Amino acid sequence: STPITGKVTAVIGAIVDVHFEQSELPAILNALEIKTPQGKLVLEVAQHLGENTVRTIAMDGTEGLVRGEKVLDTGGPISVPVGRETLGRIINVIGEPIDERGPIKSKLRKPIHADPPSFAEQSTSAEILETGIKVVDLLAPYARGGKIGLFGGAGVGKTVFIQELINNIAKAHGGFSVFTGVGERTREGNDLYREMKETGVINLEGESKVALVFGQMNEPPGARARVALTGLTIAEYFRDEEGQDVLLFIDNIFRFTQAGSEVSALLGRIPSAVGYQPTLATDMGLLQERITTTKKGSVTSVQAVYVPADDLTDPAPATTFAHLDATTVLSRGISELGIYPAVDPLDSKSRLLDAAVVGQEHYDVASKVQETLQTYKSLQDIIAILGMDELSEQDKLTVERARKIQRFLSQPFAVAEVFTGIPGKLVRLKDTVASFKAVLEGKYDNIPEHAFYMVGGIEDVVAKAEKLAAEAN
Amino acid sequence: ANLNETGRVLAVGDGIARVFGLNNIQAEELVEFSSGVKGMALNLEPGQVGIVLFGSDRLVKEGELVKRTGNIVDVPVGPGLLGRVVDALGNPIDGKGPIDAAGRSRAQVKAPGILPRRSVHEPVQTGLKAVDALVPIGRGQRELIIGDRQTGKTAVALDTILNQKRWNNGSDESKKLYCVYVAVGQKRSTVAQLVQTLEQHDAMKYSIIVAATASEAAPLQYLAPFTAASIGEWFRDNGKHALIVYDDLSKQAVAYRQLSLLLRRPPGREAYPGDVFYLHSRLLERAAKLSEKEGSGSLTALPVIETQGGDVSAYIPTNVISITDGQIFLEAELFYKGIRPAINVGLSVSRVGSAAQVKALKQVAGSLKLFLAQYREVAAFAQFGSDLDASTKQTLVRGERLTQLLKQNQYSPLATEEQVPLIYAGVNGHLDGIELSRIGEFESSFLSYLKSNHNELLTEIREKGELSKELLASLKSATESFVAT
Amino acid sequence: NLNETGRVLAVGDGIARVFGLNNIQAEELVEFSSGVKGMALNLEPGQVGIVLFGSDRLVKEGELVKRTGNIVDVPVGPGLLGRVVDALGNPIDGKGPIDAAGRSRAQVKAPGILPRRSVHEPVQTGLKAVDALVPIGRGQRELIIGDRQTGKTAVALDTILNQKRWNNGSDESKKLYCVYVAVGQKRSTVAQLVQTLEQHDAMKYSIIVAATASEAAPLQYLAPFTAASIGEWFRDNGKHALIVYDDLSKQAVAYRQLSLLLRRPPGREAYPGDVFYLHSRLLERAAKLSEKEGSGSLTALPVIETQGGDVSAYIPTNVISITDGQIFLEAELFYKGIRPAINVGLSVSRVGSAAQVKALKQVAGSLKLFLAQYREVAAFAQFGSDLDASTKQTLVRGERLTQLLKQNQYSPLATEEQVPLIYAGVNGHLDGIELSRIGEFESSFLSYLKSNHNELLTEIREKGELSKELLASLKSATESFVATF
Numbered sequence A: 001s002t003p004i005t006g007k008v009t010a011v012i013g014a015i016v017d018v019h020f021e022q023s024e025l026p027a028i029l030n031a032l033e034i035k036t037p038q039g040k041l042v043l044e045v046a047q048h049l050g051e052n053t054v055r056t057i058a059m060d061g062t063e064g065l066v067r068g069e070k071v072l073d074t075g076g077p078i079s080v081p082v083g084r085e086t087l088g089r090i091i092n093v094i095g096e097p098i099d100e101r102g103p104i105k106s107k108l109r110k111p112i113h114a115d116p117p118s119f120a121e122q123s124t125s126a127e128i129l130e131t132g133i134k135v136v137d138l139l140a141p142y143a144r145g146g147k148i149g150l151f152g153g154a155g156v157g158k159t160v161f162i163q164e165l166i167n168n169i170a171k172a173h174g175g176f177s178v179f180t181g182v183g184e185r186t187r188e189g190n191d192l193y194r195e196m197k198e199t200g201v202i203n204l205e206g207e208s209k210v211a212l213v214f215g216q217m218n219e220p221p222g223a224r225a226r227v228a229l230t231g232l233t234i235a236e237y238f239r240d241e242e243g244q245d246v247l248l249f250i251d252n253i254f255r256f257t258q259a260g261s262e263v264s265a266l267l268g269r270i271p272s273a274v275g276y277q278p279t280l281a282t283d284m285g286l287l288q289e290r291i292t293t294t295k296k297g298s299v300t301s302v303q304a305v306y307v308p309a310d311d312l313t314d315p316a317p318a319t320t321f322a323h324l325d326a327t328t329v330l331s332r333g334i335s336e337l338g339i340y341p342a343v344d345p346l347d348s349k350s351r352l353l354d355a356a357v358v359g360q361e362h363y364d365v366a367s368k369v370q371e372t373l374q375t376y377k378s379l380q381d382i383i384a385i386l387g388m389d390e391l392s393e394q395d396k397l398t399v400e401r402a403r404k405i406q407r408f409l410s411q412p413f414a415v416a417e418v419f420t421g422i423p424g425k426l427v428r429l430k431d432t433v434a435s436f437k438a439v440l441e442g443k444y445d446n447i448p449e450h451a452f453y454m455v456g457g458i459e460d461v462v463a464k465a466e467k468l469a470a471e472a473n
Numbered sequence B: 001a002n003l004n005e006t007g008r009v010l011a012v013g014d015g016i017a018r019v020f021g022l023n024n025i026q027a028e029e030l031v032e033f034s035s036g037v038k039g040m041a042l043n044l045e046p047g048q049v050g051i052v053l054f055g056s057d058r059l060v061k062e063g064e065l066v067k068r069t070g071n072i073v074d075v076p077v078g079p080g081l082l083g084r085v086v087d088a089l090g091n092p093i094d095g096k097g098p099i100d101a102a103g104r105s106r107a108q109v110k111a112p113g114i115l116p117r118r119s120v121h122e123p124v125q126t127g128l129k130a131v132d133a134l135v136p137i138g139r140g141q142r143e144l145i146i147g148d149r150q151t152g153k154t155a156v157a158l159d160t161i162l163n164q165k166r167w168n169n170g171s172d173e174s175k176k177l178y179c180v181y182v183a184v185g186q187k188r189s190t191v192a193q194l195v196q197t198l199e200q201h202d203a204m205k206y207s208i209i210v211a212a213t214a215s216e217a218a219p220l221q222y223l224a225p226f227t228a229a230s231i232g233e234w235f236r237d238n239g240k241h242a243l244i245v246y247d248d249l250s251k252q253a254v255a256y257r258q259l260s261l262l263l264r265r266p267p268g269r270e271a272y273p274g275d276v277f278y279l280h281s282r283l284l285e286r287a288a289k290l291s292e293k294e295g296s297g298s299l300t301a302l303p304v305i306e307t308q309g310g311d312v313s314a315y316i317p318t319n320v321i322s323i324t325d326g327q328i329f330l331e332a333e334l335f336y337k338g339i340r341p342a343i344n345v346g347l348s349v350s351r352v353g354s355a356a357q358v359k360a361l362k363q364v365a366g367s368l369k370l371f372l373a374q375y376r377e378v379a380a381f382a383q384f385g386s387d388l389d390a391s392t393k394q395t396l397v398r399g400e401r402l403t404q405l406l407k408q409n410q411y412s413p414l415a416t417e418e419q420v421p422l423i424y425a426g427v428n429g430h431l432d433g434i435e436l437s438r439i440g441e442f443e444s445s446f447l448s449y450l451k452s453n454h455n456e457l458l459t460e461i462r463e464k465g466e467l468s469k470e471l472l473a474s475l476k477s478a479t480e481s482f483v484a485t
Numbered sequence C: 001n002l003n004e005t006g007r008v009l010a011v012g013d014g015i016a017r018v019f020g021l022n023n024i025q026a027e028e029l030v031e032f033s034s035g036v037k038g039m040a041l042n043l044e045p046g047q048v049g050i051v052l053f054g055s056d057r058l059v060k061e062g063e064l065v066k067r068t069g070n071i072v073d074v075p076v077g078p079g080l081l082g083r084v085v086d087a088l089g090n091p092i093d094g095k096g097p098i099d100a101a102g103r104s105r106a107q108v109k110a111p112g113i114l115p116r117r118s119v120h121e122p123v124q125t126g127l128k129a130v131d132a133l134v135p136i137g138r139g140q141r142e143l144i145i146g147d148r149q150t151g152k153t154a155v156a157l158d159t160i161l162n163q164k165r166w167n168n169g170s171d172e173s174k175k176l177y178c179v180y181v182a183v184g185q186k187r188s189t190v191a192q193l194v195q196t197l198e199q200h201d202a203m204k205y206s207i208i209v210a211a212t213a214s215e216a217a218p219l220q221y222l223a224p225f226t227a228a229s230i231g232e233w234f235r236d237n238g239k240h241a242l243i244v245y246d247d248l249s250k251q252a253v254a255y256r257q258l259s260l261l262l263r264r265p266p267g268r269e270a271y272p273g274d275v276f277y278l279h280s281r282l283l284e285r286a287a288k289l290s291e292k293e294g295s296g297s298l299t300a301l302p303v304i305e306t307q308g309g310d311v312s313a314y315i316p317t318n319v320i321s322i323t324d325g326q327i328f329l330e331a332e333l334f335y336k337g338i339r340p341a342i343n344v345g346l347s348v349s350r351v352g353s354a355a356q357v358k359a360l361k362q363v364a365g366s367l368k369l370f371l372a373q374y375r376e377v378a379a380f381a382q383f384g385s386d387l388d389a390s391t392k393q394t395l396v397r398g399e400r401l402t403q404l405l406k407q408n409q410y411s412p413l414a415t416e417e418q419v420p421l422i423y424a425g426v427n428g429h430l431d432g433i434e435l436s437r438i439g440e441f442e443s444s445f446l447s448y449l450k451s452n453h454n455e456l457l458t459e460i461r462e463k464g465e466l467s468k469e470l471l472a473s474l475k476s477a478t479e480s481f482v483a484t485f
């Protein structure tokens, strides 16, 4: 019928050259297959060398290939199954399951390469996306269909902060989530999957809420630079089909740029500034632009960021930040004070922190909180040297005020119910703004500081103050 | 198989295509493939031809059919583009139906000769006080907007457009100033929301939008500035005035260095090709003031450049500065201290400002720029805490008052008539006595004092646009009397 | 034949390009008329590029070459223990032919996501500054990064020696076979390194894969993978194997050489794009197999040599990104006396307590604290006694806590001997003792316990924990010795 065959003519590293029949060469970015003792080899088209010969990039090992072997053409770019059947399933860049849970019985299969939504389909107004964390909605809110930067490695409970956003949104917006790992450490990938089954974000017997698509580091650049697109595709499905506020997690956006750099390196393309690929600028957009809010649904991206040599002048970071709308930083010094999550109020900033966006009230309320903490950070010197008595009636007041606000930021994670044992809470933007608004006015100066630690709601704050005081009697 | 107007694709990759044939094709001539993708013969060799791809190479297969357009790449130009959003090709992307173009112009036009030109002399109120006082812009000037990420680079260009509404709604034509915004390498949402703000302020009626998103192929971002330029050149030749803003040219060069490196070209500084200068050069030159014989039309340009860590010594930046007629640097430090717009008077410059500035401002603001320049030198030299003399201290008190007076909120454009009064007080020193925390409220309260009382002065500076020897005295006695109370 | 044979078209730079072998596999071995063998890494339509394992003086033009039909393979199994083999796996010590239990391909795929377990089995290195501060786990990838002549090998070397505590025992799930991978080191060095392990009776369970600098580049390329398989054997069969790559830096250089000579695209610092794929496909091979897989485990200690502390370099950045922690070493710290000079500030471990004995964890949780505050108040130590008492207390501890970590080379201590020293340090029973006698303190203190409180030490060795009873018994025994001292 329509069987397309070719023959390998060149093998150089992850770069393989196949020869097809005249006027029958598959287009570019397609998917070629080769028979291998393990399973099969996948080759993504890249260039048409000429003379009925095309150059593709290997998506797996190339050791063993021999000049002449047949090469099948799927005819279309790499495909990944889409649907509720991917939830709670480990999927690789090729789109095949590796969780040993059998084949993913899906109805449809979308390609990894998709054109960015049109200008007319774009929204004309940015709205805030209620997450479920006071430290977020009040300080650095998440933009609906925007890009958020997550800083800080292990030790700050990064993983714990991720599974959280997946639960909250699943209960408030009921939108699923998609985790994508580019050059993910096989070690961490294991502990992640397992942890997710312990928290409840992923249930085998019941219903999962988030789909996993890891791209091991021991994989060739070809696959590494496509992992992101694989996870994006699955997410766009629930945006255009079910129209949900899906969250796409990428860890880490840095290895995605590195991946491209190795690929473009082998192809022969000349190295740009700092060594990165010239095409870097366009690639970044072929991923960030696809993540937006449409008239049907929306996709919010929560991707980590790595700063090469603690330098922001570097192209990779420079280019990434150009799309970021908010940044949730996770400092060690924050979790050191017993503050969970370890979100840093000072570093966490958002491009939707204006009165023309969150309202004049929300604005002023958030601004005062930052002002209270800012002046408190500078007093952390004269206080630990000459005592606290070294403050005026107005200074000493704000100081005792900040002590409550900083602690009040903390929030019990509903996902870490089996970890701590304490019932988690889901604070809404409606109550959050009203909470701090009443603290600033100074309506709880007689209330103990411990009454604001790990408090779900303002109403619960007083509920705890009464218990602590009763136990003292 | 006519190897004279059509050929076959020999190879494709890296965004370039080598077609065989097309013996009657012109240099840099638009073309189309079997898939419908438009290209351009950037180079001609014996036995083959180089074509750039304006779309994804996925759609270009090896061995397809290639037809020629017979005309160089051009874009629809006319008054019908007003209120309409198009791309690099000139096609509508908003979905309000096809564009009503009066004609078609080449994408690559040569700048007007030396003879058919005149020095700029027509002020262009930006609405910003600190701007139209230190580094004013005139019809036909090329004012650069350099600054780091999130410093308010577009915030100065955007407010300018909204302030033009004061003359665009008038009857007279020579007063109106059309606007043409250019977005290249930006996000979809970023532009969409940008358009929405224009509609809220009802400024889209007299503005044209050209799109070159990052998702779009590099070349689109490369040709976007040139084409968008021709859109506004039309108004110039018709004796009208236009205003085009590139946001931003720095990304373009990056997009171009891509095709530059892909086509195997010896790398230069920061991996930019040696011909990167001719890029922005050929583009800016097409913005000037024509002679009266031409139509007395003009084309003001506002290119934007993004630097790193406040480095104006970079390559791309300097290349632009050696073309534009002045810069408006936006330091981040001043931006965080509240000082917004964060205009750094130290690096800000205007090569043809006084020539195109209102005489009412030239009189009240004398040597204000140089003073501020020397201000930061003595201010940053006394910030150690050391005690100084009366001479340096006196200049240090007056400098601070002026610095705070330059500050201004966004979306709050002020008439020249309203700006003149504020500058006068600063130089004289009436503000010196005034508390530092009362400088803001004072401005809003001082303007009301003139409207409620000395309104006649406002109406005189409006029409005349110059302060006579008599009005100068009536003004002094009117401010001094207010400073006392 | 032309299909199983080929003719040398050109030879040089240890790389000869042959014509023919139309059925040869990728990275497959081949044999020349002379006897020297090579493997084809590049498979071109016309010719085939093949690297050499020996001098290119043997290979001539037109010479005949035949296939081997086998990929780079090395013999694995328990027979290697106590031997010294080269990259290929041949004997070089002169102890006779090797007795392997099978072969494994140089290139093996890392264990999948599912067949693994969170590391939980500690790898006692016998280094106080390590097992206390940066704990290592069976299956972890801890990186030994540091400048030249800093003590990188010392760390690993002591680790191996510290294994006589379990390998000469009876239980297998407790032992740990050591596989050292000499890359780019002169023979004299290897011959000595080996001679040290023998004088300590460590060769009984150590495998040396020597890859001297004089040997062909590819040998230095395959060495790490060769040795990798050898250890995996132990891992697959349900055991424990420790492999130390010393050093990966030299490996990359070798690989760079082959890649350049073969005319492959040069990247940052002349390293091909697949250089990262090299180490990532090596380190990921070591892990912790689950209970179903055999509970086997392979630990990796890769060594990287920086150039003046530059951890920002290409190669280091790659390695540091893949591993799971670093044992950064600085020459400066070495000069002061702090040996091994393990920068506590930088040295980190992502697994941490997960793989550390609870007997030591109970006294180490706090030791990271004091040291942390010590580095912050280290400048004060240089000033007069005008320092308040609060900060002064920190200095008293730090000086002594830092003095305790100083451990002589070739002198590993068991956990039963570490806990007593850490416990006395943390509480502060040494603060009264002079900072000059801290060294002899360890000697006389250990000998004391092993004669009067031997029952306590042995309970810590077996239980691995410290009950409220021991915590009190240990404290009483300490205060008693400090008193009599």
Ligand SMILES: Nc1ncnc2c1ncn2[C@@H]1O[C@H](COP(=O)(O)OP(=O)(O)OP(=O)(O)O)[C@@H](O)[C@H]1O
Pocket: A354, B147, B148, B149, B150, B151, B152, B153, B154, B155, B340, B341, B408, B409, B410
């Ligand atoms: N005069 C001002 N007063 C207060 N806020 C301002 C002022 N000017 C700009 N801003 C704020 O700065 C924010 C950043 O937007 P802006 O476009 O000014 O930055 P930019 O440097 O132009 O960014 P880009 O160059 O990427 O477009 C705006 O959302 C605006 O609210």
Ligand SMILES: Nc1ncnc2c1ncn2[C@@H]1O[C@H](COP(=O)(O)OP(=O)(O)OP(=O)(O)O)[C@@H](O)[C@H]1O
Pocket: C147, C148, C149, C150, C151, C152, C153, C154, C155, C305, C339, C340, C407, C408, C409, C410
């Ligand atoms: N713990 C220690 N105690 C005393 N001396 C030590 C210790 N560790 C290392 N040395 C000294 O270090 C020298 C060799 O250091 P080492 O081999 O550990 O560094 P290296 O990482 O191998 O550097 P190179 O890359 O040059 O081999 C020897 O002369 C020895 O005296």
Ligand SMILES: [Mg+2]
Pocket: B152, B153, B154, B155, B247, B304
């Ligand atoms: Mg801007």
Ligand SMILES: [Mg+2]
Pocket: C152, C153, C246
């Ligand atoms: Mg060494």
